[PDB]
Amino acid sequence: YKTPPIKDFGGFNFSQILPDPSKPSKRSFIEDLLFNKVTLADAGFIK
Amino acid sequence: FQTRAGCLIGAEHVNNSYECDIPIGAGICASYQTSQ
Ligand SMILES: *[C@@H]1O[C@H](CO)[C@@H](O)[C@H](O)[C@H]1NC(C)=O
C-alpha cells in the first residue's frame, strides 16, 4: 500500500514515521535514528 | 552475474521481478522459466 500524496489526516501527523524520499534508502526519521543507534558488527558484505 | 551474496554463474539476469522461487540472498531469487 502507498500513502496518498496529500496528508490530510484530520490534524494527526505521521511525517516522522512515514518514508522520507530524500534518503537513498527510503526509511523514516525514526527508522534512521534506530539504525544509527545500533553499532552493528559483521554486516556480511561482499568484502 | 555479480550479487551481494557472491558470483552467480549459469543463471541469466533479468530486470523483471517475480515472487521468490529459490532464495539466493541479498534480495536475489532464482527460478526456472522461459526454450527454458
Ligand atoms: C534491464 O533493466 C533496465 C530496465 O529498465 C534497463 O536497463 C534495461 O531494460 C535492461 N538492462 C539490462 C542490462 O538488462
From Swiss-Prot, chain A:
Glycosylated residues, chain numbering: N13
Residue ranges of the region described as Fusion peptide 1: 28-47
Mutagenesis / variant outcome for changing D8Y: In strain: 19B/501Y, Omicron/BA.1, Omicron/BA.2, Omicron/BA.2.12.1, Omicron/BA.2.75, Omicron/BA.4, Omicron/BA.5, Omicron/BQ.1.1, Omicron/XBB.1.5, Omicron/EG.5.1
Site feature: Cleavage: R27, S28
Described function: Precursor of the fusion protein processed in the biosynthesis of the S protein and the formation of virus particle. Mediates fusion of the virion and cellular membranes by functioning as a class I viral fusion protein. Contains two viral fusion peptides that are unmasked after cleavage. The S2/S2' cleavage occurs during virus entry at the cell membrane by host TMPRSS2 or during endocytosis by host CSTL.
Protein name per Swiss-Prot or TrEMBL: Spike protein S2
Parent sequence residues shown: 789 to 835 of 1273
Curated annotation (Swiss-Prot), chain B:
Disulphide-bonded residues: C20-C29
UniProt-reported outcome of changing T34A: Partial loss of O-glycosylation by host GALNT1
Impact upon substituting A11V: In strain: 19B/501Y
Recorded superkingdom: Viruses
Effect on the protein of changing H13Y: In strain: Gamma/P.1, 19B/501T, 19B/501Y, Omicron/BA.1, Omicron/BA.2, Omicron/BA.2.12.1, Omicron/BA.2.75, Omicron/BA.4, Omicron/BA.5, Omicron/BQ.1.1, Omicron/XBB.1.5, Omicron/EG.5.1
Glycosylation-annotated residues: N15, T34
Protein function: Attaches the virion to the cell membrane by interacting with host receptor, initiating the infection. The major receptor is host ACE2. When S2/S2' has been cleaved, binding to the receptor triggers direct fusion at the cell membrane. When S2/S2' has not been cleaved, binding to the receptor results in internalization of the virus by endocytosis using host TFRC and GRM2 and leading to fusion of the virion membrane with the host endosomal membrane. Alternatively, may use NRP1/NRP2 and integrin as entry receptors.
Summary of subunit composition and partner proteins: Binds to host ACE2. RBD also interacts with the N-linked glycan on 'Asn-90' of ACE2. Cleavage of S generates a polybasic C-terminal sequence on S1 that binds to host Neuropilin-1 (NRP1) and Neuropilin-2 (NRP2) receptors. Interacts with host integrin alpha-5/beta-1 (ITGA5:ITGB1) and with ACE2 in complex with integrin alpha-5/beta-1 (ITGA5:ITGB1). May interact via cytoplasmic c-terminus with M protein. May interact (via N-terminus) with host bilirubin and biliverdin, thereby preventing antibody binding to the SARS-CoV-2 spike NTD via an allosteric mechanism.
This protein's name: Spike protein S1
Lineage summary: Viruses, Riboviria, Orthornavirae, Pisuviricota, Pisoniviricetes
Gene giving rise to this polypeptide: S
